[model samples]
Target chain A: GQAADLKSTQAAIDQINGKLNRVIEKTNEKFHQIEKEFSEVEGRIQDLEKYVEDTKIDLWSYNAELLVALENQHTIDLTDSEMNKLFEKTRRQLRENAEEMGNGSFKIYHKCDNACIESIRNGTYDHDVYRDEALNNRFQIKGV
Target chain B: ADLKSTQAAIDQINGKLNRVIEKTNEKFHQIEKEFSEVEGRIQDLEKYVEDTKIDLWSYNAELLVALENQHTIDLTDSEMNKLFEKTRRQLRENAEEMGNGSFKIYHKCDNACIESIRNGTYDHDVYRDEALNNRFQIKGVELKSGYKDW
Candidate 1:
């Protein structure tokens, strides 16, 4: 009777071993599938960024050409009405191009202000000079 | 009787030994199964970590590209303005040298009209707008024409 009992116990152990092996195999397969999905999602995000960048470059180049055509020509005899009409049209193009490139989410400046425009033209507000000076005197040690 | 009793004792000892051997085999098999599961899990974890690193690298590349593009915009805007100013100055100098009266134009408009137009009372015209816009766009330089419109 003792020998028979021992044989039954050994058979039970064998059954447990088989089930454990199967569980381990299934877990490995599931984990691998999850990793693959993650990689594919990452690739898709990169592709989307690349597509947007290319569009931005193309739009910027086109606007650059238009600007050249506008500024190089003489403008002494033209009436204010004539020049203003042209400016409005050019501004419209810039807005459209920026929107197209950024999927309607691009902003170049803080806010459009008449005072700001006057300051820029009068040379009272020099962004480029300020920017360059800021660069030259920038402090690198934030902790200090 | 003594010899028979001794043989029975030996049989009992053999039975105990067999049971112990079977128990040891079962224990080893259990440990082996646990170790295999652990190894498989570690492999899966390694793959996950590798994928995460690749994603991080891609993100870094994207950041680099964005910074570069912004820098290009900054440089181009400045260059465009410089080019525009150069052209304007050259034209003015040429006109003066030819004794063309400094390219002056006058009208019935008062100082207030000039000030308002310059100060943002008048709408932007095509030539002025185009010239200013061109300064920024043509040379890839960034120039502010001032106004919320652009």
Candidate 2:
């Protein structure tokens, strides 16, 4: 081909190449933005999943709820979760304040994520369900 | 430029285009992977709502004290009705958006809703009425749903 013909074709090809590059860059950006959004959505979904799991009622748990209600005064009912960060932050307050607790046995913090009278699993949380030997029938709340 | 030089530049541009195409494809793949995960999780949430075997009286606060120890609900029939009505009132009061829609100056979108799974924001309950309206329109759209149009 002549020099002019080659230059003209090159110009047209260059124009198309530029557009392709720009479009690809923009397309990549959109995909990344959408991908990032989906990741955030995944995290939100995880939290919701935990909520459902947390609020769900199981078969044997009814018995535990009933027992707590039956012993309402002697043993107050409170839910604590392994995933509950509040439990650790508020633990010391409950422990120290428990000694000064108003009459009636100390409230039982039901480990909501576990079962009624479920055996404690080590390394599961920041606290443990222990008995206070000195205090009569009082639960010894200890930070792990 | 000579054909040889022009073709070299074209080849160079083609390389970049190809790389960009590859990168775009990769990014799209990731987007799809993550959205599918989100969708599956949403289904799990729906399943939980549908499948939780918790009894009807599970929401009673006084009758069943909530505990971390995973557990359980119950009430007499008439008593249960009263309890439900009382709880319903409490819910109605709490969800001022629907409870007194026109009465409250700020009632339009300030409704009770579960947190969004896509975005952990409140106030998604407003979508409920829109969906409700859509369902009604579907009835008006056609008397019967085509068995397999969907």
Give me the displacement of residue A69 in model 1, in angstroms.
3.0
**TM-score of only chain B in every candidate structure:** 0.43, 0.38
lDDT, candidate 2, B1-150, per-residue tens? 344444444455455555545554554455455455445445444443433322223344334333322342333434334444543443343333344331121221111212343344322211111111111111112324467465
For model 2, the stretches where C-alpha displacement exceeds 4 angstroms are: A1-10, A53-65, A68-144, B22-30, B53-150
lDDT measured at residue B121 in model 1 versus the true structure, 0 to 100 = 28
lDDT of 2 by residue, A8-41 (tens): 6646575655666666566656646665665555
Across residues A13-132, which tens digit of lDDT does each residue of candidate 1 receive?
A: 454444445444644554454455444434433433343344343334434433443344431222567665665564565575444446433443323244332322222111110000
Q: For each candidate, what is the lDDT?
A: 0.36, 0.39
Query: Each candidate's chain A: what TM-score?
Result: 0.44, 0.40
Best by TM-score: 2
Q: Go through the candidates in order and give each one's DockQ.
A: 0.02, 0.06
